Amino acid sequence: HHLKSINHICFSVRNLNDSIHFYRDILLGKLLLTGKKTAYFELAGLWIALNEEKDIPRNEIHFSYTHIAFTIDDSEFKYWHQRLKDNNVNILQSIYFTDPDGHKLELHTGTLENRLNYYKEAKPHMTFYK
Amino acid sequence: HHLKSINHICFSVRNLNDSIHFYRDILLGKLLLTGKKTAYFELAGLWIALNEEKDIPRNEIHFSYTHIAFTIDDSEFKYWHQRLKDNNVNILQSIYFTDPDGHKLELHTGTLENRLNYYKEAKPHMTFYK
């Protein structure tokens, strides 16, 4: 009875139209549905749901404790960096950035296996499980 | 140049040992690595990274604006509800719950296609995109 797969991700956003431009044009996702306060995309094979909450305060820090990373090919790194820079995205083997509200996102060019093998060399006092 | 897939998710957590018990025993994920302040799992085919931040305030609301849903078979609904209840998990076609810190999670038994077809009947004033 294991969990089978990731099903979807949902984010609260302040302005649906700004978020549709981000997810669908900048990140090249597919818009599937809208309501007055909702939008669904398919991005990288993943269902993403957006819920508009116009009152999330803009003068406070939110979204600090989660990040979501998507896979790109290594060869596409400069393409994506330039695309995000040319669209004035907030940019902080990985590109770290935020959506228009501040949800933390990452583009990464490696696998979990790559990362484990990297840490076995770089951080050998970690404990690795079979 | 589309994004290829979801790569991983990272969460900040206050107590690594409490979170390892949650992700690995209660949710049946696989522990792959630990450090003093890090743990990696594979859960539902997804790399999840945990970063321990012992100072996230316990007396404030956090994690409000994101949720992550995992797929289960319809027939496993009562199994999972009972498993989470019997492990004193905070429970709020879906089961809504939190991890020990408050990260919002969901078990869902349907697909995006199912949901679109549901809304075409239940919420017919939404706009549906081909």
Curated annotation (Swiss-Prot), chains A, B:
It is found in: Cytoplasm. One of its GO terms (molecular function) is transferase activity, transferring alkyl or aryl (other than methyl) groups. It is an enzyme of class 2 (transferase). Its cofactor is Mg(2+). Its main location: cytoplasm. Residues 5-110 form the VOC domain. InterPro entries: Fosfomycin_Res_Enzymes, Glyas_Bleomycin-R_OHBP_Dase, Glyas_Fos-R_dOase_dom, Metallothiol_Trafse_FosB, VOC. GO terms for biological process: response to antibiotic. The keyword Phosphoprotein does not apply. Mg(2+) binds at H8, H67, E106. It comes from the Bacteria. Keywords: Antibiotic resistance, Cytoplasm, Magnesium, Metal-binding, Transferase. The active site is at E106 (proton donor/acceptor). One of its GO terms (cellular component) is cytoplasm. Belongs to the fosfomycin resistance protein family. FosB subfamily. Metallothiol transferase which confers resistance to fosfomycin by catalyzing the addition of a thiol cofactor to fosfomycin. L-cysteine is probably the physiological thiol donor. Homodimer. This is Metallothiol transferase FosB. The gene is fosB.
